[PDB]
Design a binder for these strands. Sequence first.
RNA 1: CGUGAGUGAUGAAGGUCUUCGGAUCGUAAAACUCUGUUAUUAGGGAGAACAUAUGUGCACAUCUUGACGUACCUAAUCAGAAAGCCACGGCUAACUACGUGCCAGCAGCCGCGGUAAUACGUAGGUGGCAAGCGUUAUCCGGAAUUAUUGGGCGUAAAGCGCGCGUAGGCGGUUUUUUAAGUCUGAUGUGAAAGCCCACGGCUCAACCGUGGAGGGUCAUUGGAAACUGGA
Lengths: 198, 130, 156
Amino acid sequence: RFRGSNWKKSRRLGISLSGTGKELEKRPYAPGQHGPNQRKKLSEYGLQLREKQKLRYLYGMTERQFRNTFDIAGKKFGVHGENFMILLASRLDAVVYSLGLARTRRQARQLVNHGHILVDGKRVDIPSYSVKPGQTISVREKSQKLNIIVESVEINNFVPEYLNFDADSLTGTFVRLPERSELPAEINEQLIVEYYSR
Amino acid sequence: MTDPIADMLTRVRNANMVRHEKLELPASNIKKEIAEILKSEGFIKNVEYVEDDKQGVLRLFLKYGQNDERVITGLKRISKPGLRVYAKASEMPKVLNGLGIALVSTSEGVITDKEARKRNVGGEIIAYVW
Amino acid sequence: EFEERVVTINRVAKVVKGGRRFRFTALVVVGDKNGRVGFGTGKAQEVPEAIKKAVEAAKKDLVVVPRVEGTTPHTITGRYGSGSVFMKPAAPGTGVIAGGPVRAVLELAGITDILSKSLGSNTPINMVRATIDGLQNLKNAEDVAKLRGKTVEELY
RNA sequence: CGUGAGUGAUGAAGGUCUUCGGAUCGUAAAACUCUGUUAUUAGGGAGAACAUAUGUGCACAUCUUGACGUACCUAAUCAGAAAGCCACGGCUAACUACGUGCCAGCAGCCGCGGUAAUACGUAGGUGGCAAGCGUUAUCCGGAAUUAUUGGGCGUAAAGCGCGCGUAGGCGGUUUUUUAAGUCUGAUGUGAAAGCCCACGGCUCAACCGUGGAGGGUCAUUGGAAACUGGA
């Protein structure tokens, strides 16, 4: 949806969490123009905007397309501060990042056709799938065994919580309740819980 | 007297700055429990009983620490004549969840803020002198 | 033991009788690694002896910054000079980033729940003076309770 | 759905800055496999719901329809193309060579033009964002700025020279009053393109029941007087 390089997400933002090594062959200093100079200090509203831009490259849906995402991480009752990390893992990228189909989120959004999609009935080729207690995000009859669906079947052993994945199946249908602290913590919570409100 | 607690607010505050153990607040007809509403906690310490004659003068009996430490860091006026700060069932405030006693008078005379939400009423506490 | 933040060492091209005198004004934040701001400037020929010079001559310009339950007690401002700041509360278990003004003010207050705010300009001589203006004008829980002189749960 | 890479030769035939030092527009890349999600003909088919022998007290029988008739989609798996315009020394996330050289450009803030303006114009570009991009008039971030939270009674934003007088705006009078008053009282009602505590789906859009809950009610004295200006 960004149609650009996916290597500037760990340079303009301060929370990428998409790859292990990225500053090994790059230059982990400051920005681009003044990359050989010193760094700065994120502003009050800037830190909440930097995280939004940091999640802008991470989340497939950008400004206006992620309406539900922001709407579910604000008005929704519960821990408003940690509502951006709780009610935001209901996408189709989580299933691919828990079964072993795509290591990135952008590739996980395009893995809703090449990889497992048939979630025990009606499927969805969007970046977010309605996986609830009863949906088994699996593959189709003709696309039972794919190349991107059965790529890292043995390379990705450790799986995440509230997710299921096996050999020649990769059907997620475990717990429906997820963790609100089972995600990277680099951005502020109350800051985004107030700024968004406005 | 134009302001009921005019000298009252300019006495304890001044006595809590120059460290005045005994105070001389001009007692009136409602200047008794209004200057001793914090007798439950320890803000204005406590007193035996307002003793004078037809609105004469009332003491506050302020107490300090070893090196004269004031518990109150300056007292300002809030509920005065003219406007009315009646706290109904709108929204009751909270900070440390229970500590001292304030200005919440209804039909029980002088009560604390512990049951302020229970009664859901917010008035001004007052009392006569002797 | 003490989080000393040496931002930069402003130099000067003195055009006096001497060819080119070099005066390095090493700038270092005099923080006590707790929640105080701290700011001192030196003027010695040796930066190391100049950084400590302002840390031993200016270490009482700090201000005690308490915390409620892991969130800024009050969103204060800063009206001292050109450069200004702002206190934005966040969740106790969070973090900070880069991009804006000074970073040695909320970083000293190990809480990871405050966002350092200071637009004004880039001049780092009138932007840190506004940060201490709001830090000293901060509103605490009991601090405001004494202002009214009633109960702590009667002014919220 | 959104338009091709499961794969992948310094991925060049030599150029992008090149003091050529390497990297690369370049895990761009060949030429296929791949990726399905383009056709090829297709037969297709809620506001508003009960009827028409003469056999039937706000109930109903032989016999009452079309101006139509191709979302999400994992499927045929032809090959149907996210480009763009802008700042680039910047302010403000952004550039290299030439060509210019107060000629022209640039031109909110800056300013850059009388020589070495990567600020100019072309090429290789870069930061942004999203099927596009620069423009014109219209609220609020900007910031309290007739100050209201948000004005002084002096330099600031502030000395009516007017010395003699009731604008009812307002300036101790003890006690003292018959109840100006602070918190109780008829409550049925308590509805609402109303923030409805939930309530329905249209993937990207308009698919709407809950009047008691439900606040957005519709118990706050008749009342306890030693008290704004007036004793």
